[PDB]
Amino acid sequence: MIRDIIRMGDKRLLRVAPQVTNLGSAELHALVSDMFETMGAAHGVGLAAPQIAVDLQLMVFGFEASERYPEAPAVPLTALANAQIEPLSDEMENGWEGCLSIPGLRAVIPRYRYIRYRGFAPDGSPIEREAEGFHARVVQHEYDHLVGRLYPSRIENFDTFGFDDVLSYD
Amino acid sequence: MIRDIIRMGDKRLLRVAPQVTNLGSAELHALVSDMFETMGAAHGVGLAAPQIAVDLQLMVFGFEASERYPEAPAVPLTALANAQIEPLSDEMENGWEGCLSIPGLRAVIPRYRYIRYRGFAPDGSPIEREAEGFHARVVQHEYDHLVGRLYPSRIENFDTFGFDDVLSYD
Numbered sequence A, B: 001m002i003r004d005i006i007r008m009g010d011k012r013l014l015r016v017a018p019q020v021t022n023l024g025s026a027e028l029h030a031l032v033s034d035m036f037e038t039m040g041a042a043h044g045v046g047l048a049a050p051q052i053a054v055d056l057q058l059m060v061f062g063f064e065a066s067e068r069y070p071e072a073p074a075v076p077l078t079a080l081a082n083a084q085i086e087p088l089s090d091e092m093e094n095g096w097e098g099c100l101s102i103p104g105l106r107a108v109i110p111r112y113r114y115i116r117y118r119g120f121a122p123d124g125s126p127i128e129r130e131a132e133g134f135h136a137r138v139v140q141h142e143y144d145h146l147v148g149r150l151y152p153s154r155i156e157n158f159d160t161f162g163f164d165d166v167l168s169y170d
Ligand SMILES: O[C@@H]1CSc2nc3ccccc3n21
Pocket: A043, A044, A045, A046, A047, A068, A096, A097, A098, A099, A100, A137, A138, A141, A142
């Protein structure tokens, strides 16, 4: 079932989300299924549960082909509970981000080029991966939702922030 | 004649505008007339010429009653060329701002409570005023356009940035 994606300005995007404690259950499966469905109808590459007003440490993400990032390598379809992130180097990298809770806009945002992330699949099996580049940037971005943070508070160059149909920065 | 209001992301909002040198002329009058008309149809309280892709140090502003700031005292209808601004104290004050080039959004922005501004009416007579509060905040905001600056780069508390129909911060 497709859920409403709540928009920047809602206090529910601002909360610190608690852990998921129902791994392997029917309720988590249905929620995760809703999130992939919702991500998909809105053409997202990642979606964090608080963007659907569900206060949990959960995100889904991934795709083969993105309408919005027609330049980006495939990121595996992934549902991730209780995400923890560690930078594997200090190399920062700039890239374009948008967000389904901030429709119509995009900005350039610096993120770690290399990370490891860890957590659990919805069936409870553990997940740990090294990620680089866009894959990494997705996971760091969806993680910020779980701590009540959106991309605008990460912008360093406000010349790059604007509407997607109008921007012409490189 | 109502002009297109260009949207955040256009490089033309980012420029340092040159001075107006055609005070008292027919061309400036028609431009200023267009700006009041454009401000009015979009329900603005201020409009700076670069928001209409006109690269000049010019702004119009003022109103008796605002749809968007139903709480705010009347600010006199004013067209101002070659604006210069000086804070008359260091008291900063927070208040809500939006912008016609950033439709649908608003944030809390700190501005000087007290200023003086100086420049010229379109007929060439000089203007100097002390302004406080909302009047001051309008003029400082429209001035930032003339130097290629929008309000998001002034936000200190990103919890207050969001869509106008969704926000519930105090
Ligand atoms: O603009 C898209 C739609 S959803 C999403 N999550 C993201 C994380 C990083 C970079 C881009 C995105 N986007």
